[PDB]
RNA sequence: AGGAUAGUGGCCUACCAUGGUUUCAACGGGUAACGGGGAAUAAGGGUUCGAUUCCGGAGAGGGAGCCUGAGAAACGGCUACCACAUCCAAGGAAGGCAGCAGGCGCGCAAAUUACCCAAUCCUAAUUCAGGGAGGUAGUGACAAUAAAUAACGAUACAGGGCCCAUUCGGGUCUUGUAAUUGGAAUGAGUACAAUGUAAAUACCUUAACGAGGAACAAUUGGAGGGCAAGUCUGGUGCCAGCAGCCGCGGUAAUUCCAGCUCCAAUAGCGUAUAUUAAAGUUGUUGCAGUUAAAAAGCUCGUAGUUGAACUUUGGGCCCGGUUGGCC
RNA sequence: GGACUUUUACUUUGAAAAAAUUAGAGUGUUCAAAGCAGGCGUAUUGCUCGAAUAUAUUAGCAUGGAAUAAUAGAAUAGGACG
């Protein structure tokens, strides 16, 4: 019974069956294929720097109506283009075009967050200054 | 306070078995006025480039300067 | 390179951050014993969990086991010496009944409060921190000193402290000088 | 997917909110003193107990 | 790699030296000599760490370069000289002699001996071979060769060396009911009597040893060192006589001593 | 069989034979692979990590070759070729920081071109010389330990206490509130000095100075639920924004922006990425497959896995110990 | 020395399996993380406790057992015993 071998000398069958079915997990498949290294905007990194290409107004998903004020940026280390959300009231006037930003994920390891469709990154800093510090007026955006 | 202590037999045994830094601390021996470690090493490396005493090249460059 | 140093954490955070049933119990303990924060309770809980684990895993084995005898006697002796466990109820199964309040009442703050000289646990803590208490001849300014049942009779004001004598005090000196000036001389 | 999404309206509410300065109040004690006052405010001075213990009740 | 190593990192030194983890990145690497470095005690370790006659290696060198210390009757000014089991260390001042024997906890213990015992030493026969010109000789455990030995001296026997001339004054055969000393393994420091031995052709002869108070254990033949007969050892035993009390009754003795 | 090697060996050569490995996975491909001691987590079983303090291996821009030597296929040795790079009077000559410090570049990502051989050890002809090995300090919120930002004093008081509190009257021990009002306690910081150390800087001590807003002023993140904490007050009106998830915002928003208040951890707190438990959502322990995903259309069949029962059982005699009803 | 051996799986016990790390004994680093120190005399020129212990798998090596599972024997007797 149970549809799996039980004999004392069936360890090879059990180990191989577990190895084969292990490929149906998400995390095991990503680790073994090296997807983060190969197919991921960051090179497996938590943060990445980019140059802002343009400012975008992303419409909110149902049942919400809003313009989400994102930026299209190109990463320095690999040249990939991503969309990053700029989190706070305002803070899109702090970003500007051709500026340098630092990006993190939202927190869902991919998996666009909330009502923002197809956006997986958020801006942490611009021109070397924390966006939170610029929003709280602790610091000021450098001219350069 | 808690510390350590040694008492020797006479002056000479202390002055031979005691480290230089403690001799200098107690005033028995003076501090040797040596150059800094870096410039000492640089001078040693400079002398490494010289084979022999150096009077040969010294008078040769003196001839070149006073020709 | 030089051999690595060994260090460990002395506390563990609870699995559930926000549960009122123990949040208020922790605030009760902190208010009763004049503790700075919840880490001071977490440390005692970590220590007591270690001791309870040791006693449980050492009672699971039968008597007259040399392992159980040696480590059980060592743990019993240590707890009795520090005073968290009384002279009576001196057994491993009686170790499991220990509570955080036992170590908290064996803290230096608690004893300094109990034997007069403090009138309050908060006064006890500031008194200890301000180098006014000597457990023996030694000034101890650590409120969690964990007195060990043989230094209780020896807790008094430090001889180098104004409460111990021989010094009036910084502010006392300043105002004595000012008061003498305002009086005359 | 609204390419025409108006970005000119960013910061509207935070710009138009009336600026109200924080009031000057005495400093609150920090550390064991703060735990002391919290203990008194929660276990000794139990002010509002309407129905059950209430910890941030409003006026009325 | 590329040649012999000259450094010994601390935490890689033998544990029985009892070196403090801190206060130094390195440990005294024993020089080549009569004993393997794993089961040897360097002079600097014995003089500084064990006897506290020196504060540091500089003072150890100051001691040695004055010809004060001598091992087995020779000055041996080498700081890291590998003094090992059964060796006799002599200090010209303080009028004392030491014999290097492990205590029961498997480490060399500071054991003082008299001049008569310091005059000689014991050695374990590692091999009996015919040398050049047909001259027989034996090799002891401390890397010593003695020509013209007794014909009845076989391998793993014990010989008594006069230590003033490298000559054998007596020998003990390896036989049942003889007091042996364990020099390796988990039984370092034990002193007991041979019960019997297991042959095991193909390697690792096994010896059964009974303690004085009837603790029976087994050990490899390579760790067995004959030191006499049932009672009356040829060498003064260290304090303890190698019995290996259990930790509970060591605790009980410690408490009886401390608390009177 | 010979040659070569320090030596065994297809290590190489001559001749001969046709062998050797493989579904019990050879061979090939990939590795964001140096192996291990070990680390994180962890009821048990496991999962994940290990470039990095110890051990072993390998390498010194990439290859190859070699000298000297006991020991090197060495690179702070040489030789050549390749790539890179320096000086030049143009003839030529000199190079190898994956040692220490430091610079450029790279990126999310990592410190002084400091002091010293005093300690640990190492090397030499050697007690003495040398050692960026090592140690000391600098930078340093990687991580960890301990724990300052205050503690004691006036007048209304729910009366929780005693003459049936019949009088804001009385010792009711009252911790418990109202910018008030008073002394006392002290280290953060400063520096006599000594100690500390090769010298020092700090630490432990210590003469004086050092508190009233003790301005000597604690932060971070939250207050719908998960999940502790607001039907408080303004502003906004599906906008701006918030929101891990569910959701909150279209004129009375407990969810946004603020003020007040409160909560949580606290010299730390939040965020991102990865990983572990939670996960009996990888399963041996221990899943599921009629309908939720999942019984090959059916049968044959090799490897693999697994395979009925039976052969000396049962009886007696001795020796030799014990959480156990009286020396 | 041979008129000397069916072969295993399995299980017991034992030798070894670096140190550090881990668990853990002792010790007022003022407490603690730590470290492996320290403690006691009248200090009249000295006595002394330590620096334990446990585990570290699979394979190999010995070693007691012979239930369980496999393997072999005497069928054209080319069989055993002297
Ligand atoms: Mg090397
Ligand atoms: Mg050949
Ligand atoms: Mg051949
Ligand atoms: Mg690699
Ligand atoms: Mg590694
Ligand atoms: Mg190499
Ligand atoms: Mg040579
Ligand atoms: Mg170099
Ligand atoms: Mg080199
Ligand atoms: Mg460098
Ligand atoms: Mg270094
Ligand atoms: Mg709010
Ligand atoms: Mg709630
Ligand atoms: Mg279906
Ligand atoms: Mg079917
Ligand atoms: Mg089909």
Q: Using CA atoms, how far apart are residues E114 and E111, in angstroms rounded to an integer?
A: 10
C148 phi/psi in degrees, rounded to 5: -120, 40
Provide the token pair at E111. Answer: 């054991």
Does the domain spanning E1-116 belong to CATH 3.40.50.300?
A: no
Is residue C175 included in any domain, yes or no? yes
Those residues whose C-beta lies under 8 Å from the C-beta of residue C117, and which sit 6 or more positions away, are C124, C127, C133, C156, C157
Ligand nearest to the CA of E4: 1
Q: How far is CA E248 from CA A85, C82, C95, E160, E192, in A?
A: 68, 22, 21, 38, 22
Provide the token pair at C76. Answer: 């019993």
User: How many angstroms separate the CA of residue B39 from the nearest CA in chain E?
Assistant: 27
For residue E251, the chain C residues in CB contact (below 8 A) are 70
Provide the token pair at A64. Answer: 């919400």
Q: What is the largest CA-CA distance in chain A?
A: 74
Q: Could E248 and C70 be called an inter-chain contact, meaning their C-beta atoms sit closer than 8 Å?
A: yes
Provide the token pair at C105. Answer: 């009442």
Sign of torsion over alpha carbons E6, E11, E14, E17:
positive
Contact C158, C134 (CB under 8 A): yes
Cβ burial of C103 (10 Å; 0-12, 13-18, 19+) is buried
For residue E24, the chain C residues in CB contact (below 8 A) are 2
Q: Using CA atoms, how far apart are residues E41 and E71, in angstroms rounded to an integer?
A: 12
Q: Using CA atoms, how far apart are residues C134 and C54, in angstroms rounded to an integer?
A: 33
Which among C51, C167, C37 has a CA at the least distance from the CA of C102? C51
Q: Using CA atoms, how far apart are residues E82 and E63, in angstroms rounded to an integer?
A: 17
Provide the token pair at E141. Answer: 């455990």
Those residues whose C-beta lies under 8 Å from the C-beta of residue C40, and which sit 6 or more positions away, are C30, C144
Q: Could you tell me the residue range of the domain that residue C175 belongs to? A: 17-185
Q: Using CA atoms, how far apart are residues C127 and C142, in angstroms rounded to an integer?
A: 10
At B18 the three-state DSSP class reads coil
CA B23 to chain centre: 16
**Number of independent structural domains in chain D:** 1
Q: Using CA atoms, how far apart are residues C155 and C153, in angstroms rounded to an integer?
A: 6
DSSP string, E45-81: IIIIIIT-S-SSHHHHHHHHTTT-EEETTB----TT-
* Burial call D27-49: b when 16+ CB within 10 Å, e when fewer: eeeeebeebbeebeebeeeeeee
At B41 the three-state DSSP class reads helix
Contact E48, E83 (CB under 8 A): no
Sign of torsion over alpha carbons A49, A50, A56, A61:
negative
A90 C-alpha to center of ligand 8: Å?
55
Q: Which CATH class is domain E174-244?
A: mainly beta
**Number of independent structural domains in chain C:** 1
At D22 the three-state DSSP class reads coil
Matching residue, tokens 């499991």: C96
Q: How far is CA E72 from CA E54, E100, E160, E163, in A?
A: 21, 11, 13, 6
Q: Is C65 on the interface with E (CB under 8 A)?
A: no
Q: Is C66 on the interface with E (CB under 8 A)?
A: yes
Contact E167, E183 (CB under 8 A): no
Provide the token pair at A42. Answer: 């960051």
Which among A82, A50, A54, A80 has a CA at the least distance from the CA of A69? A54
Q: Is E11 on the interface with C (CB under 8 A)?
A: yes
Q: How far is CA E82 from CA C94, E33, E79, in A?
A: 54, 6, 9
Given A55, A58, A89, which is nearest D14 (Cβ)?
A: A89
Provide the token pair at D58. Answer: 């409003």
Q: How far is CA C146 from CA C7, C81, C105, C111, in A?
A: 21, 11, 9, 9
Contact C75, C55 (CB under 8 A): yes
Is residue C5 included in any domain, yes or no? no
Q: What is the pairing mode between strands E96-99 and E88-91?
A: antiparallel
Q: Could C70 and E25 be called an inter-chain contact, meaning their C-beta atoms sit closer than 8 Å?
A: no
Nucleotide with smallest C1' distance to residue A108 CA: F244
At what resolution in Å was this solved?
A: 2.2
Q: Using CA atoms, how far apart are residues E121 and E166, in angstroms rounded to an integer?
A: 10
Matching residue, tokens 């030296």: E17
CA C139 to chain centre: 15
Q: Could C66 and E251 be called an inter-chain contact, meaning their C-beta atoms sit closer than 8 Å?
A: no
Provide the token pair at B5. Answer: 């202590």
Beta bridge pairs of residue E108:
E102
E1 C-alpha to center of ligand 5: Å?
19
Provide the token pair at E194. Answer: 């041979």
Instruction: Report which DSSP code applies to C131.
Output: T
Given C27, C36, C125, which is nearest D39 (Cβ)?
A: C27
Helix (H) or strand (E) holding E146: strand E145-147
Provide the token pair at D23. Answer: 């009031």
| CATH no., domain E121-171 | 2.40.50.740
Matching residue, tokens 């350590």: B4
Q: How far is CA E189 from CA C110, D51, E139, E220, in A?
A: 50, 77, 23, 14
In Å, what is the separation between the CA of E196 and the C1' of G5?
26
* Burial call E54-86: b when 16+ CB within 10 Å, e when fewer: beeeebbbebbeeebbbbbeeebbbbbbbbbbb
Q: Is the peptide bond before D30 cis (omega within 30 degrees of 0)?
A: no
User: How many angstroms separate the CA of residue D16 from the nearest CA in chain A?
Assistant: 12
Domain ranges of chain E: 1-116, 121-171, 174-244
A21 C-alpha to center of ligand 14: Å?
20
Q: Using CA atoms, how far apart are residues C177 and D5, in angstroms rounded to an integer?
A: 76
Q: Using CA atoms, how far apart are residues A97 and A73, in angstroms rounded to an integer?
A: 9
Q: Is E186 on the interface with C (CB under 8 A)?
A: no
Provide the token pair at C126. Answer: 């500031």
Provide the token pair at E66. Answer: 């004055």
Chain D touching partners, 3 or more CB pairs below 8 A: A, C
Q: How far is CA E185 from CA A68, E33, E210, E223, E224, in A?
A: 73, 22, 16, 7, 10
At C164 the three-state DSSP class reads coil
Beta bridge pairs of residue E182:
E224
Q: Is A59 on the interface with D (CB under 8 A)?
A: yes
Chain C touching partners, 3 or more CB pairs below 8 A: D, E
Q: Could you tell me the residue range of the domain that residue D45 belongs to? A: 1-60
Those residues whose C-beta lies under 8 Å from the C-beta of residue C72, and which sit 6 or more positions away, are C55, C58, C59, C92
A3 C-alpha to center of ligand 16: Å?
21
Contact E110, E100 (CB under 8 A): no
Q: Mutating which of D35, D42, D56 best tests the C interface, going by the most C Cβ atoms within 10 A?
A: D35
Provide the token pair at E55. Answer: 């504060």
Which among E70, A59, D46 has a CA at the least distance from the CA of D54? D46
Q: Could C27 and D38 be called an inter-chain contact, meaning their C-beta atoms sit closer than 8 Å?
A: yes
Provide the token pair at A124. Answer: 């942490």
Instruction: Report which DSSP code applies to E214.
Output: S
In this structure, what is the dihedral angle of CA atoms E239, E243, E249, E250, given to the nearest 10 degrees? 40
Q: What is the largest CA-CA distance in chain E?
A: 67
How were these coordinates obtained?
cryo-EM
At E138 the three-state DSSP class reads strand
User: How many angstroms separate the CA of residue A43 from the nearest CA in chain D?
Assistant: 28
Nucleotide with smallest C1' distance to residue E44 CA: F121
Q: Using CA atoms, how far apart are residues E234 and E238, in angstroms rounded to an integer?
A: 13
Q: Using CA atoms, how far apart are residues C23 and E97, in angstroms rounded to an integer?
A: 69
User: How many angstroms separate the CA of residue C51 from the nearest CA in chain E?
Assistant: 21
Q: Using CA atoms, how far apart are residues E149 and E161, in angstroms rounded to an integer?
A: 12
Helix (H) or strand (E) holding B17: helix B11-17
Which among E211, E13, E189 has a CA at the least distance from the CA of E101? E189
Given D5, D11, D14, which is nearest A57 (Cβ)?
A: D5
In Å, what is the separation between the CA of E5 and the C1' of F39?
30
In chain C, the residue whose alpha carbon lies closest to the alpha carbon of E9 is C1
E112 phi/psi in degrees, rounded to 5: -90, 140
In this structure, what is the dihedral angle of CA atoms C134, C136, C141, C147, given to the nearest 10 degrees? -120
* E-state strands within chain C: 133-134, 156-157
E16 C-alpha to center of ligand 11: Å?
29
Provide the token pair at C66. Answer: 């040399």
Is residue C8 included in any domain, yes or no? no
Helix/strand/coil (H/E/C) assignment for every residue in C51-104? HHHHHHHHHCCCCCCHHHHHHHHHHHHHHHHHCCCCCCCCCHHHHCCCCHHHHH
User: How many angstroms separate the CA of residue B52 from the nearest CA in chain E?
Assistant: 34
Which among E163, E209, E169, E161 has a CA at the least distance from the CA of E185? E209
Contact C103, C84 (CB under 8 A): yes
A74 phi/psi in degrees, rounded to 5: -115, 125
Provide the token pair at C127. Answer: 């008194």
Helix/strand/coil (H/E/C) assignment for every residue in chain A? CCCCCCCCCCHHHHHHHHHHHHCCCHHHHHHHHCHHHHCCCCCCCCCEEEEEEEEECCECCCCCCCECCEEEEEECCCCCEEEEECCCCCCCCCCCCCCEEEEEECCCCCCCCCCCCCCCEEEEEECCEEHHHHHCCCCCCCCC
Q: Using CA atoms, how far apart are residues D32 and D46, in angstroms rounded to an integer?
A: 20
Those residues whose C-beta lies under 8 Å from the C-beta of residue A11, and which sit 6 or more positions away, are none
Nucleotide with smallest C1' distance to residue C130 CA: F186
CA E207 to chain centre: 19
Chain D residues 33-52 within an 8 A CB cutoff of chain A: none
Q: What share of chain C is helix, strand, coil (3-state, %, to 5)?
A: 50, 5, 45
Contact E41, E100 (CB under 8 A): yes
For residue D21, the chain A residues in CB contact (below 8 A) are none
Cβ burial of C141 (10 Å; 0-12, 13-18, 19+) is middle
A85 phi/psi in degrees, rounded to 5: -80, 140
Matching residue, tokens 């199964």: C93
Q: Which nucleotides of strand F come closer than 7 angstroms to any CB of the protein? A: 24, 31-32, 48-49, 53-58, 70-75, 106-109, 114-123, 127-128, 130-135, 143-153, 175-177, 183-187, 195-199, 205-206, 209-211, 213-215, 217-218, 221, 223, 227-232, 234-236, 238-250, 256-267, 271-276, 281-285, 287-289, 295, 304-307
Q: CA-based angle E196:E199:E205, to the nearest 5?
A: 85
Nucleotide with smallest C1' distance to residue C3 CA: F53
Q: Using CA atoms, how far apart are residues E94 and E63, in angstroms rounded to an integer?
A: 13
E24 C-alpha to center of ligand 7: Å?
30
Those residues whose C-beta lies under 8 Å from the C-beta of residue C168, and which sit 6 or more positions away, are C162, C176
Q: Is E62 on the interface with B (CB under 8 A)?
A: yes
Those residues whose C-beta lies under 8 Å from the C-beta of residue A44, and which sit 6 or more positions away, are A36, A37
Q: Could A69 and D2 be called an inter-chain contact, meaning their C-beta atoms sit closer than 8 Å?
A: no
Helix (H) or strand (E) holding C47: helix C39-59
For residue B19, the chain E residues in CB contact (below 8 A) are 58
Instruction: Report which DSSP code applies to E9.
Output: E
Q: How far is CA E151 from CA C62, E121, E129, E131, E228, in A?
A: 58, 21, 11, 14, 20
Q: What is the pairing mode between strands A121-126 and A129-130?
A: antiparallel
Beta bridge pairs of residue E82:
E42
Contact A27, A110 (CB under 8 A): no
């Amino acid at each position: 019974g149970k549809g799996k071998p039980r004999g004392l000398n069936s360890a090879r069958k059990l180990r191989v069956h577990r190895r084969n079915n292990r490929w149906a997990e998400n995390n095991y498949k990503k680790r073994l294929l090296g997807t983060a290294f190969k197919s991921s905007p960051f090179g497996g990194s938590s943060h990445a720097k980019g140059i802002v290409l343009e400012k975008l107004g992303i419409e909110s998903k149902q049942p919400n109506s809003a313009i989400r004020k994102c930026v299209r940026v190109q990463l320095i280390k690999n040249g990939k283009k991503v969309t990053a959300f700029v989190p706070n009231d305002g803070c899109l006037n702090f970003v500007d075009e051709n500026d340098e930003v630092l990006l993190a994920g939202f927190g869902r390891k991919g998996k666009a967050k909330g009502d923002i469709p197809g956006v997986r990154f958020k801006v942490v800093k611009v021109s070397g200054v924390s966006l939170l510090a610029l929003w709280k007026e602790k610091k000021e955006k450098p001219r350069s | 306070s808690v510390g350590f202590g040694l008492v020797y037999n006479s002056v000479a045994e202390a002055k031979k078995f005691e480290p230089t830094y403690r001799l200098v601390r107690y005033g028995l021996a003076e501090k040797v006025e040596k150059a800094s470690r870096q410039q000492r090493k640089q001078k040693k490396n400079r002398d490494k480039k010289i084979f022999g005493t150096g009077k040969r090249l010294a008078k040769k460059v003196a001839r070149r300067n006073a020709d | 390179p030089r051999a690595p140093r060994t260090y460990s954490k002395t506390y563990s955070t609870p699995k559930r951050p926000y549960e009122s049933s123990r949040l208020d119990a922790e605030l009760k303990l902190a208010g009763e014993f004049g503790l700075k924060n919840k880490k001071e309770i977490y440390r005692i809980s970590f220590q007591l969990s270690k001791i309870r684990r040791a006693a449980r895993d050492l009672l699971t084995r039968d008597e007259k086991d040399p392992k159980r005898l040696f480590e059980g006697n060592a743990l019993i002796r240590r707890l009795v010496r520090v005073g968290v466990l009384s002279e009576d109820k001196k057994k491993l199964d009686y170790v499991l009944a220990l509570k955080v309040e036992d170590f908290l009442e064996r803290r230096l703050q608690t004893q300094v409060y109990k034997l007069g000289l403090a009138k309050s646990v908060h006064h006890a803590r500031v008194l200890i921190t301000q180098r006014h208490i000597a457990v023996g001849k030694q000034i101890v300014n650590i409120p969690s000193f964990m007195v060990r049942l043989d230094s209780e009779k020896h807790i008094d004001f430090a001889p180098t402290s104004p409460f111990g004598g021989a010094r009036p005090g910084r502010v006392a000196r300043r105002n004595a000088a000012r008061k003498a000036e305002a009086s005359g001389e | 997917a609204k390419v025409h999404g108006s970005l000119a309206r960013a910061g509207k509410v935070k710009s138009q909110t009336p600026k109200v300065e924080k009031t000057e109040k005495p400093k609150k004690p920090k550390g064991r003193a703060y735990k002391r006052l919290l203990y008194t405010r929660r276990f000794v001075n139990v002010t509002l107990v309407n129905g059950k213990r209430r910890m941030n009740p409003g006026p009325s | 790699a590329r040649g012999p190593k000259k450094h010994l990192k601390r935490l890689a030194a033998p544990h029985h030296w009892l070196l403090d983890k801190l206060s130094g990145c390195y440990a005294p690497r024993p020089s080549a000599g009569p004993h393997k470095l794993r089961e040897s005690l360097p002079l600097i370790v014995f003089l500084r760490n064990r006897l506290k006659y020196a504060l540091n290696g500089r003072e150890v060198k100051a001691i040695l370069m004055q010809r004060h210390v001598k091992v087995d009757g020779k000055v041996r000014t080498d700081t890291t000289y590998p003094a090992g089991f059964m060796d006799v260390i002599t200090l010209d001042a303080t009028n004392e002699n030491f014999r290097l024997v492990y205590d029961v906890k498997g480490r060399f213990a500071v054991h003082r001996i008299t001049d008569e015992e310091a005059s000689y030493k014991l050695g374990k026969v590692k091999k009996v071979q015919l040398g050049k010109k047909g001259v027989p000789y034996v090799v002891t455990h401390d890397g010593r060769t003695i020509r013209y030995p007794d014909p009845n001296i076989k391998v793993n026997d014990t010989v008594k060396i006069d230590l003033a001339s490298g000559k054998i004054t007596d020998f003990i055969k390896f036989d049942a009911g003889k007091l042996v000393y364990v020099t390796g393994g988990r039984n370092l420091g034990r002193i007991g009597t041979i019960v019997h031995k297991e042959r095991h052709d193909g390697g690792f002869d096994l010896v059964h040893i009974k303690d004085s108070l009837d603790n029976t254990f087994v050990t490899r033949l390579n760790n067995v060192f004959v030191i006499g007969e049932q009672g009356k050892p040829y060498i003064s035993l260290p304090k303890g006589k190698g019995i290996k009390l259990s930790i509970a009754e060591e605790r009980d003795r410690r408490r009886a001593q401390q608390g009177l």
